């Protein structure tokens, strides 16, 4: 395949190319070229910070404790993974992204506190 | 609350707003503006590198194996967490920061080596 080769593939199939996409995020006139590189770095770091905040700091794929709400475009399970591409999915739930992210942050802080308490039990 | 809303709160109470603060670290004339952004990125990375070095790479809160020395401003336990703010605490132990950081780095390298040996036991 190669970079974005999986863009037209189903969401399930495309889950096998996350490595490929991840590597291509990093790999006066001149000042505007320099500005663009700096902004690209800041963007990269923001995505990494969210993964860190959500408790998914070193994974391309991870699980969380936030249940999927049926209100968030319930489109079955197999229909999403086998008969839809990621480009379509990103529109199906575009109005829920901020809700989901907020939930992911909250159901991390709750976990860190529980872990901290357990480490204090002699 | 919001960004720095917890600054006047006790250290204990303020531990619940770490997420808020973390997100606001990332979120010729023009060249000096560009320079400032670059330096902000380097600062951010230095803090992340220390967390990585200390074995606390993806957590807002983590525990270590370094004991607290009573010489490091022993101010009880409940007094620190309930009747002090983080701004005050940062002055109470400002002369011990480098000592603590050095200890945190050493009591990581010792742990990585022990883990490495255990993974070689058939």
């Amino acid at each position, epitope marked *: 395949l190669g970079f974005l080769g999986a863009a037209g593939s189903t969401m399930g199939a495309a889950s096998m190319t996350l490595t490929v996409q991840a590597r291509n995020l990093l790999s006066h006139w001149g000042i505007k070229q320099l500005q663009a590189r700096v902004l690209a770095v800041e963007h990269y770091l923001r995505d990494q910070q969210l993964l860190g905040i959500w408790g998914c700091s070193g994974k391309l794929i991870c699980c969380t404790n936030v249940p999927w709400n049926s209100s968030w475009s319930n489109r079955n399970l197999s229909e999403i993974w086998d008969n839809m591409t990621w480009l379509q999915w990103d529109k199906e739930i575009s109005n829920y992204t901020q809700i989901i992210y907020g939930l992911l942050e909250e159901s991390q802080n*709750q976990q860190e*506190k*529980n872990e*901290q*308490d*357990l*480490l*204090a*039990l*002699d | 609350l919001g960004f720095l809303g917890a600054a006047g709160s006790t250290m*204990g109470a303020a*531990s619940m707003t770490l997420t808020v603060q973390a997100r606001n670290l990332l979120s010729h004339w023009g060249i000096k503006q560009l320079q400032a952004r670059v330096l902000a990125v380097e600062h951010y990375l230095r803090d992340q590198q220390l967390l990585g070095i200390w074995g606390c790479s993806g957590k807002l809160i983590c525990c270590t194996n370094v004991p607290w020395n009573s010489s490091w401003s022993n101010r009880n*336990l*409940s007094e620190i*967490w*309930d009747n002090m703010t983080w701004l005050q605490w940062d002055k109470e132990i400002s002369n011990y920061t480098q000592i603590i950081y050095g200890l945190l780095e050493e009591s990581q390298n010792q742990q990585e080596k022990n883990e490495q040996d255990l993974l070689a036991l058939d």
Partner: antibody
Amino acid sequence: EVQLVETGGGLVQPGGSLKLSCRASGYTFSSFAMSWVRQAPGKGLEWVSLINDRGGLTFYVDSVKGRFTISRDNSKNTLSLQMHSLRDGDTAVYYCATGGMSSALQSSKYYFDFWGQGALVTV
Amino acid sequence: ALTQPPSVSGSPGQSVTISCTGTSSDIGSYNYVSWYQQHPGKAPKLMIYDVTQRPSGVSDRFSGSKSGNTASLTISGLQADDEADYYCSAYAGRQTFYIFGGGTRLTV
């Protein structure tokens, strides 16, 4: 004045269920871990369950592990215990108590400071 | 369970000792052994915690100690008002959390 006041209880058939509750005041409810302690008629004291102050961590004695639920509502200042699949061996006074584990920032206790008077449960 | 054997007694004004024997790892490793005063039909009162501490509201009469795998409660000069069952309990390593001892009766 710290008070823990239990309610609920009564006689239930073996194989049945019931729920106990405890209201509390005189202290910040949300600042303390709580537990239920069993006083069987002639045994005096048995630990049953422990819940932390945020209501997220629960621990049980093995004998009730698959049957009892310990829960909290910090807006109501209420502790509660749901007991399922009751046995005759569970006949006891069940006491509401504050203590046990703590927040890890505040001098963990590992003992009980306050007791209610307890609900009587017969099975 | 921990064992506090029956029974302990003495005349008013005499000191008495109430024992509590554990096993190996429970009260041997954890300095979280408490004592309670249990009245016949009332909720128990905390007397001793950790090893040697007592809460406000508890008089000087009650003190205690631990050695090896055995703990004890000492009453420095017994009152008739102390006719209660005594119970010891201790932290159990996050496995069983707390172990209560069989209690023992004090007669004055």
